[PDB]
Amino acid sequence: VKWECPAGYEVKEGLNVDFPHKGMKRAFIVYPAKNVSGPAPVWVPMTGSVESTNDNLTVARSGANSILADHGYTVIAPVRACANQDPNIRGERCNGPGSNGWNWNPWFEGRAADPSGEHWKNDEGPDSSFFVAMVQCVGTKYKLDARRLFLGGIASGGTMTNRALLFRSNFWAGGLPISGEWYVTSDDGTPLSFDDARAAVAAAPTKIHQGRVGPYPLPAKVGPLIVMTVWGGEKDLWNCTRPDGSRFLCADYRPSTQAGSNFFSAQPDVVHVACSSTHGHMWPQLNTQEFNRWALDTLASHPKGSDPRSFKLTQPPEGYTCHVGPFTGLYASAW
C-alpha cells in the first residue's frame, strides 16, 4: 500500500467533498480511531439503497457505524455517486435500476443483465477504484494499518463489498458483505432472471456459481482475505418498487449469501465465516453494536497474509450463529 492523494487534496476529519476520481467528484466521511496509538485498522462501511450514508453512520437501527471509531477503527465511509455528494440522501435518485451497464444505482456493484453490462465483466468499475484511492488518500493524514483495511455494508452495500473483494483482493484485508447479492449466472456467464438464479443455487447449493457481482469468470485465485458473509434469515428478501409505487420480490439473499460463501470458502488463502441471524434485510438488529464490535474485531484478528489455519473464531453475540466455511443451514444436504 502506497499513501497518496490527488494533487492538492486536503483530507480532513468529517466530510470530504470534491474528491476527483475517474471524471467524477466524490465524497466520504472520516471518523479517526479513538484510544489507538500507531496505525489503526480501517472500517469502510457502505449503506444500501434507501438508508443515507449518515443513517448508516449514526442511526442505531441502521448500524451507527461511526461508533466503531470509539472502538479503535478509523472509519472511512463513502457517499454513493447517485447521492451527488450529499450524505443525507436516502433513496432519492439512488433506489432503482442502474445505468451505463450497471445493474443497480446505489453503487457500481454488478453488471446489468443486458449487453450494456459486457464491459463490466472485467473492469472493477468506479466505486471499487474510488474506495482504494479514498483509503490511500486518508492514509496520508491518519496512520492506517495496511494489513487491516476492511470494507462492508448492507444490501446493495453488501453487493458492493462482494464486488470489491473479488476485484481488489490484493488491497483489502477482508470484508463484511451483509445480505449482498451475487447475481448468479450460468457457468457461461449468461445472466439469469431473479427466479432462474434462485433456482440454480437451490439445485446445486454447494457449488461455486458465477455471478454478475464479479469478474467473469470469477478469479481462480484471490489474494489473502477474511470474509464474513451474513444472512438475515427467512425474511432476508427485498421487494423492489415500480414507478407506479407497487412492490414486487426482486431479491432473495439466501442464494446469494450461500453462493458467496461457497466461493470464498473454496479459496485457499481466504478464511470465510458464515453468519446467520433472524433480523431480515436490514442492518443486524439484535445487539447491533455488540455485533459490529464482534465482527470487526474478528476480521482484525486475521491481518492480511495471516495463515488461515491460525484463525480462531470466538462466539458471536446472542442472536447470531456463525462458523468457518460455507453456509450449511440454508439448503438441505446432498447426503
Side-chain angles (χ1 to χ4, degrees):
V1 176
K2 187 159 111 163
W3 310 116
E4 66 196 316
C5 288
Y9 197 82
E10 317 181 274
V11 181
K12 56 176 286 293
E13 169 172 6
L15 181 66
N16 288 263
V17 302
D18 297 326
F19 181 86
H21 189 73
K22 289 179 176 178
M24 298 179 82
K25 308 264 244 196
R26 308 297 305 263
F28 57 91
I29 300 172
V30 176
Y31 287 81
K34 299 305 207 5
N35 295 326
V36 170
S37 75
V42 167
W43 171 223
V44 175
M46 293 175 287
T47 192
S49 296
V50 172
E51 294 162 312
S52 68
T53 289
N54 175 57
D55 289 334
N56 175 268
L57 288 167
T58 66
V59 173
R61 276 188 33 269
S62 296
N65 278 277
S66 67
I67 302 310
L68 280 149
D70 292 331
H71 201 57
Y73 292 74
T74 285
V75 180
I76 306 174
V79 176
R80 294 170 293 167
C82 58
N84 298 140
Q85 305 196 68
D86 182 350
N88 296 299
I89 279 284
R90 282 174 172 160
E92 307 97 323
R93 301 171 285 289
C94 282
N95 177 28
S99 63
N100 300 302
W102 296 101
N103 187 70
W104 202 242
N105 212 37
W107 304 101
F108 300 115
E109 41 83 312
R111 66 181 167 99
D114 62 271
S116 65
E118 180 73 11
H119 176 52
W120 306 122
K121 283 177 167 184
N122 282 284
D123 186 315
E124 67 184 322
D127 266 335
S128 178
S129 58
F130 159 47
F131 303 154
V132 172
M134 172 186 75
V135 171
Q136 285 174 155
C137 180
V138 174
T140 68
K141 188 184 147 61
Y142 295 101
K143 296 185 183 167
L144 307 185
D145 179 346
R147 296 186 68 204
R148 288 189 176 82
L149 305 176
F150 299 112
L151 86 175
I154 177 68
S156 182
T159 311
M160 184 68 239
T161 297
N162 281 330
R163 184 169 188 94
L165 293 168
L166 292 165
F167 279 96
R168 283 285 187 158
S169 67
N170 296 305
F171 179 73
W172 303 106
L176 179 63
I178 306 178
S179 301
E181 256 288 9
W182 201 253
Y183 302 128
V184 169
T185 65
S186 300
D187 285 349
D188 66 5
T190 306
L192 297 172
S193 58
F194 161 64
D195 286 335
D196 284 353
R198 193 190 208 179
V201 176
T206 66
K207 70 117 119 175
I208 290 166
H209 292 268
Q210 300 295 316
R212 296 186 285 127
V213 70
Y216 178 71
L218 293 174
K221 197 171 184 177
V222 299
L225 299 168
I226 172 165
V227 181
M228 184 181 285
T229 301
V230 182
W231 176 60
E234 296 293 322
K235 301 295 222 315
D236 189 358
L237 305 165
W238 177 249
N239 295 136
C240 280
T241 303
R242 292 183 188 103
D244 76 4
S246 52
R247 310 284 294 266
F248 67 100
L249 181 64
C250 55
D252 178 342
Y253 301 88
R254 176 198 306 268
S256 60
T257 58
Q258 182 74 61
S261 81
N262 293 352
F263 175 85
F264 289 117
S265 292
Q267 288 291 314
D269 296 335
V270 177
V271 169
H272 183 272
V273 178
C275 281
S276 299
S277 191
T278 54
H279 65 291
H281 195 65
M282 50 196 324
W283 197 274
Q285 296 292 114
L286 303 166
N287 300 309
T288 300
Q289 291 300 318
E290 289 179 44
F291 175 79
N292 291 356
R293 289 187 290 269
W294 175 78
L296 262 297
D297 293 351
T298 291
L299 300 181
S301 77
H302 197 70
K304 197 174 185 64
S306 281
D307 187 342
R309 295 177 310 130
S310 69
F311 178 77
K312 296 192 167 299
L313 190 64
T314 64
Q315 191 173 294
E318 190 179 358
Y320 304 82
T321 298
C322 307
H323 63 268
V324 173
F327 281 95
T328 54
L330 282 52
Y331 297 93
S333 194
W335 177 237

